[PDB]
Amino acid sequence: DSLAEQIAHHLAERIIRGELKERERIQEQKVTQTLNVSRGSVREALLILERRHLVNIGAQVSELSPQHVESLYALIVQLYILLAESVARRWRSEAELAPFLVIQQRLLNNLAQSDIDGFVEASFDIMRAAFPFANNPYLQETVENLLPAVSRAYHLALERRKAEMNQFLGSFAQLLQAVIARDEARIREVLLEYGRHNCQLVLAALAER
Amino acid sequence: DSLAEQIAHHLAERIIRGELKERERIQEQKVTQTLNVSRGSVREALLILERRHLVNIGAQVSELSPQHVESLYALIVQLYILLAESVARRWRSEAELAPFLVIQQRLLNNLAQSDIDGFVEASFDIMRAAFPFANNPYLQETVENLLPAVSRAYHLALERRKAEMNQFLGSFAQLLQAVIARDEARIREVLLEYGRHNCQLVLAALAER
């Protein structure tokens, strides 16, 4: 990771968690002083965040809107189907799926700790554990570039409804079983159904701003 | 467009057209001298090309492989379906589809001129004319970031088979009619069928390297 990428990750986590609010301003000099970093690094960090849709170029934290949320979910669900179908076709031995079981345990541990921040962080390891099965650089880079925006929406859904962690775990368990069963019709059903549900929960939160 | 983006577009067109070959080296100083540009601009231009999958960081033009070609087509077909379905649902008056008819004429004009380079260039205006219907920044930026790689593969298919221009036009006409008919099942059929056909033509060319 370049220093620009480290700074962007730091600011992205603050936007994702709701610590930096919609329309809030980010000043280059304030970030340089708080983090003890070079100004050029901060400038590049903001360009990364803009590329990842989290800020508008100083910079201002981007606003959420229903059309962009719906846009994001319509796209990410098709990318997740592609990833999950590649795991379902390519896994050869059940040992290769063990990463998903460890993530299941990590999600449960964060739920036990009432840790929404860690729950979101661990959710993204699911995609990361799928990448070696797909060996698809275009898909991987696309998903990685969208993870901050997805994170931000997903975090808002959990801020609105803690029981969504229980809901996600139930759907994830169904997805894992469908991948184990190599059932592509069921994989698409689970992802499309949970995707629409989670999107509408984000929209409910947006409507209450 | 920044100067870095202009330089990257210039080098991308040379890779897309086959003027810069797989594994060929690009030297920063050679580009600065040929184009009369700043070295920092060229350095950033290469980072753009690497982000767009056209070079590995000097830099070397990336190699094509069957798994990456299949990866690219599996992804881009789902993105095209998303775009085409949004046009099919959102167009209100047939005047709004006129851009696609003009592109049809431009494709025919390049075919008449035996201009594969211009045919590829005009093909990408189809996606660009679809963006206002989708109003989907995530989808738009994803497609824009993949257009150079798609371009390169598509250009190789036409270098292998000029009659593919006639084939593309026939399929495009069917897609436009399905969009006019707001028939989403037919939209997916046309894009999936042409996608698999064009992908296998690229694979045929790869096998003959």
Numbering used by the authors:
A (entry chain A), B (entry chain A): 7 to 63, 68 to 219
Q: What is written in the article reporting this PDB entry?
A:
The dimer of AlkR recognizes and binds to a conserved palindromic motif in the promoter of the alkB2 gene, and structural symmetry is vital for DNA binding and transcription repression. The long‐chain fatty acyl coenzyme A compounds can release AlkR and stimulate transcription of alkB2, reflecting the effect of alkane catabolic metabolites. Structural insights unveiled that the arginine residues and scaffold residues of AlkR are critical for DNA binding.
The asymmetric unit of the structure comprises a dimer of AlkR, with each monomer featuring an N‐terminal DNA binding domain (residues 1–71) and a C‐terminal effector binding domain (residues 76–219). The DNA binding domain of AlkR protein is characterized by the presence of two β‐strands (β1 and β2) and three α‐helices (α1 to α3). The helix–turn–helix motif, formed by α2 and α3, is linked to the anti‐parallel β‐strands (β1 and β2) via a small loop (wing motif). The C‐terminal domain contributes to the secondary structure of AlkR protein with six additional helices (α4 to α9), which are indicative of AlkR protein classification within the VanR‐group regulators belonging to the FCD subfamily of the GntR superfamily. A chemical cross‐linking assay with sulfo‐EGS showed that AlkR protein is predominantly in the dimer form in solution, consistent with the results of size exclusion chromatography. In this work, the Apo‐form structure of AlkR dimers revealed that the Arg45 and Arg49 are involved in interactions with the major groove of DNA, by forming hydrogen bonds with specific DNA bases. This interaction is likely pivotal for the recognition and binding of AlkR protein to its specific DNA motif, and removal of the side chains of arginine resulted in the decreased DNA affinity of AlkR protein. The structural modeling results of AlkR protein and C18‐CoA using AutoDock revealed that C18‐CoA was surrounded by the C‐terminal effector‐binding domain of AlkR protein composed of helices α4‒α9.
